[PDB]
Amino acid sequence: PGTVDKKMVEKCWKLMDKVVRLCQNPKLALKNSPPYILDLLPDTYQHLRTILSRYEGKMETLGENEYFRVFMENLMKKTKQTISLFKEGKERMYEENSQPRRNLTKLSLIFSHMLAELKGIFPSGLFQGDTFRITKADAAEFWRKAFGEKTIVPWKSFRQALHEVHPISSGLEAMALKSTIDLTCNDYISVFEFDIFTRLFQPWSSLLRNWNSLAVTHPGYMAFLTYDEVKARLQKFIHKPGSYIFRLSCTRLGQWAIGYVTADGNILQTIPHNKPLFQALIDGFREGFYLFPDGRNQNPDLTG
Amino acid sequence: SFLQRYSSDPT
């Protein structure tokens, strides 16, 4: 990427200013629940200001920052995609359950994720990518050993390097993998993104094999969905006790968010604590809570 | 804004 100059941010802001208003339209009837775009942007803007306030002068040190170059870039691109969706989605936006509208929810998550990432690679507003505290030991090794201090790497690289320890089946399996990890949708994998994945799919020992069993071949795994969407979706099995689906959490990044239907026909959502998703699923199924992955009558045998 | 959404693991 090129250099990120003071002007650059200006544009991104103007773009952010619009994306908001568009989403401020009543017809959309957007709910407060996160992800909640109407906030993620203001907050993002806010943080960017904090950052820019601290590099106040040493602006070149920042524009130079590889990761920061990426973000703004991705961000700018992302604000646009949203703008288009509206004009090239026209009145179809206000149509709940309309492809154009689903894309909107998607981006929401990204924005939420992006913010999460940014605040991580810039706690306090001062860059700290090269020293990011990776959570699981094992993983932390692989990353610092494979990429050293790099804060963000081209998908390509990450793939090759990863394949040495964890073999990637096909060119397709990898495309799937990439979609799961690349939370900021920018063909780059950051130490932050890396951490979140490795946390969700631990143990590192069998990283991809777990992923395979919890997302590649498991009907319950739901890519980019939100709390609302999970409830909205499980509603077709609304009173088919056992029916459940899982996804990534929006507020508690790095953790799971099961969505299930209670014997008394109700939709709840739990975030596994003190027990890996692997375990939650095994027990829940045993106790009659995690029986039908997304309606499906049959359930995966994680015991393998 | 704030949540409430999440429920305890039935166990």
Q: Nearest CB to B10: which of A32, A271, A287?
A: A287
Resolution rounded to one decimal, in angstroms? 2.6
CATH 3.40.50.720 is the classification of domain A218-303? no
Q: Which residues in chain A are closer than 8 Å to B1, comparing Cβ atoms? A: 32, 34, 36, 39
Q: Does A33 touch chain B (CB under 8 A)?
A: yes
CATH 3.40.50.1000 fits A129-217, yes or no: no
Do A16 and A44 meet the contact criterion of CB atoms below 8 Å apart? yes
Residues in chain A: 304
C-alpha separations of A152 from A21, A140, A159, A266 in Å: 32, 14, 13, 42
Give B9 to chain A, closest Cα distance, Å: 6
Chosen CATH of A1-128 out of 1.10.390.10, 1.20.930.20, 1.10.287.310, 1.10.300.10 = 1.20.930.20
Residue A156, CA distances (Å) to A149, A178, A182 in order = 17, 10, 12
Q: How many CA atoms lie within 13 A of A150 on its CB side?
A: 18
Between CA A160 and CA A167 the distance in angstroms is 9
CA distance A109 to chain B (A): 15
Q: B3 vs A251: CB contact, 8 Å cut-off?
A: yes
Whether residue B5 contacts residue A281, with contact meaning beta carbons closer than 8 Å, is answered with no
